[PDB]
């Protein structure tokens, strides 16, 4: 079927946020990343960590080199900054919607940079943090980024949901709407 | 098994 | 906080063809979105991609122990890592879940919208087709294209403009996890 496969070790460092990322990517899906604060390998699916292992220490050293290299690249460019590129946002569910049957809202955040975004789920205009999760920033072949936010929920005709996305490249915070019929 | 890292080179 | 941002990216890439028979290793370095220097294993040394990368290409190319490490990356790094995860990446195959249902939002007159929801499959390569009592439907077919859920599953939604009456519509799905086409029939 697919003759080609690509494994990508992708890294970034962002100033002045001092945000770094290290992750392995197979055919566009994350195998693992290294949590900067916790110095831990975080497997995208826990099963991956049962079959394979990875020493996070080397990844963190890479990030420090990328930070050093970044400061040099910054001077070399006469302090040329990154152009904000606003994301495109899509909201969908993981499976077909059914009343009172657990589902998951996915907020797909695509084609943006720098890799800094503020996402908030709203249920009936009220923020919801119960059970939310998210991925790290995934690399794109145009070297922008992609990100997923998830919200488990019980579908009902009573509730409406929004994915509030804030990004420097946007003018107003972006709200993507989802109802039972969407 | 173990994943290997590839080194990012300092300039 | 509208402070100006500065981003460095590095992508160490391993490209595989026919398992591990053919491998290309790339060591790519980016300022913002701009790739400025690159090691291509087919080339054997670092080459600047823009003017911003001339210093790095010369500097790293002057270190023989450095080039000799990157030239063995196709074996020590790419081929090794391929074997580490082969069982749960290259060989990961998850059935598609196929559901057929009329769209909860029926927006057009005379024609109704029939949905073939294909969910939770891996890998991403898939072919979804619509048949009307044995005839392939190439008119009134709308598809979302492939959608990555970000959790190692994919989904796609393929909608048919049907003529609602009594007639049998078949969604047929072909996918590398299957040894036979998956068909779901809908009789109105
Ligand atoms: C993100 O936005 C929320 C409001 O929706 C705010 O309370 C929070 O402080 C923001 N965080 C960042 C990092 O911008
Ligand atoms: C693929 O690899 C196998 C095993 O090494 C080899 O026998 C076969 O000839 C290769 N096929 C192609 C098309 O390269």
Residue numbers in the entry:
A (entry chain A): 1 to 182
B (entry chain C): 1013 to 1023
C (entry chain B): 2 to 167, 169 to 190
Please give me the paper's original passages concerning this structure.
CD4+ T cell autoreactivity against citrullinated (cit) self-epitopes presented by HLA-DRB1 is associated with rheumatoid arthritis (RA) pathogenesis. Here, we examined TNC1014,1016cit peptide, which contains citrullination at position P-1 and P2, to study the underlying TCR-HLA-DRB1∗04:01-TNC1014,1016cit molecular interactions. The TRAV35+/TRBV10-2+ PB TCR was previously isolated from peripheral blood mononuclear cells (PBMC) of patient with RA. We show specific binding to double citrullinated TNC1014,1016cit peptide presented by HLA-DRB1∗04:01, and the citrullines play a critical role in determining PB TCR recognition.
To understand the register of TNC1014,1016cit peptide (1013DcitYcitLNYSLPTG1024) presented by the HLA-DRB1∗04:01 molecule, we solved the crystal structure of HLA-DRB1∗04:01 presenting TNC1014,1016cit (1013DcitYcitLNYSLPTG1024 KK, where two lysine residues were added at the C-terminus to improve the peptide solubility) at 2.4 Å resolution. The TNC1014,1016cit peptide bound to HLA-DRB1∗04:01 in a canonical conformation, spanning from the N-terminus P-2 to C-terminus P9 residue of the peptide binding cleft, with a well-defined electron density map. As expected, the TNC1014,1016cit peptide was aligned with the established binding motif of previously reported HLA-DRB1∗04:01 presenting fibrinogen β74cit69-81 and vimentin64cit59-71 peptides, where the P1 pocket accommodated by a tyrosine residue, and the P4 pocket was occupied with a neutral asparagine or citrulline residue, respectively. In this HLA-DRB1∗04:01TNC1014,1016cit structure, both citrullines at positions P-1 and P2 were protruding away from the binding cleft, indicating that the presence of citrulline at such positions did not impact HLA-DRB1∗04:01 binding. This finding was supported by the similar relative binding strength reported for native and single/multiple citrullinated TNC1013-24 peptide bound to HLA-DRB1∗04:01 (EC50 ∼0.6–1 μM). The electrostatic profile of HLA-DRB1∗04:01TNC1014,1016cit binary complex revealed a distinct neutral charged feature at P-1 and P2 of citrullinated TNC1014,1016cit peptide as opposed to its native form (positive charged arginine in both position), likely suggesting the preference of the overall surface charge of the contacting TCR CDR loops which would affect the TCR specificity.
